[PDB]
Design a protein around this ligand. Structure first.
Ligand SMILES: C[C@@H](O)CN1CCN(CC(=O)O)CCN(CC(=O)O)CCN(CC(=O)O)CC1
Ligand SMILES: C[C@@H](O)CN1CCN(CC(=O)O)CCN(CC(=O)O)CCN(CC(=O)O)CC1
Ligand SMILES: [Gd]
Length: 128
């Protein structure tokens, strides 16, 4: 599924992302735009063998199992493919664990370089 901006914002809000660990909703929508272009099916391979999956490009090194990343962990206890679903529940729940780990949203490289320090509110402007 490729989400619309406001559609995604409302889904994210429903699952408790607005102000989660102090990050306003516009930060999350911003990150998803530049991580995946709002597409739940996005995948990107990294140089070390691991792969990033879903709207928030969660990495198979630590967070999910894809059966081809040897010596990796599965801290969200899910198949990586579950992160490619039209239903973003699993993505959201795993992201809650990541942003809680000490590093905040800096774990998302595109957020740090393209969203941090900017007017993130603009990403939910117009939405009901
Ligand atoms: C609602 C309109 O905005 C839709 N839009 C009409 C044409 N736009 C006009 C404009 O955005 O100023 C110019 C191109 N637009 C540039 C951009 O947005 O960054 C990229 C494509 N957009 C992506 C998007 O807008 O979500 C879809 C089509
Ligand atoms: C041409 C317009 O698109 C200009 N736009 C500024 C005003 N936009 C208007 C809108 O997107 O409706 C609202 C904010 N916009 C939300 C979003 O893009 O999803 C984030 C910043 N955009 C990033 C981008 O467009 O890729 C920069 C250029
Ligand atoms: Gd824009």
């Amino acid at each position: 599924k490729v989400f619309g901006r406001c559609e995604l914002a409302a889904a994210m809000k429903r699952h408790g992302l607005d102000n989660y660990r102090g990050y306003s909703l516009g930060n999350w929508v911003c990150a998803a735009k530049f991580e995946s272009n709002f597409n739940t099916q996005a995948t990107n391979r990294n140089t070390d063998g691991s792969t990033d999956y879903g709207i928030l490009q969660i990495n198979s090194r630590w967070w999910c199992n894809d059966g081809r990343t040897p010596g990796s962990r599965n801290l969200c206890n899910i198949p990586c493919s579950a992160l490619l679903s039209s239903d973003i529940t699993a993505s959201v729940n795993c992201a809650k664990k990541i942003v809680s780990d000490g590093n905040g949203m800096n774990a998302w490289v595109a957020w740090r370089n393209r969203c941090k320090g900017t007017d993130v509110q603009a990403w939910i402007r117009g939405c009901r």
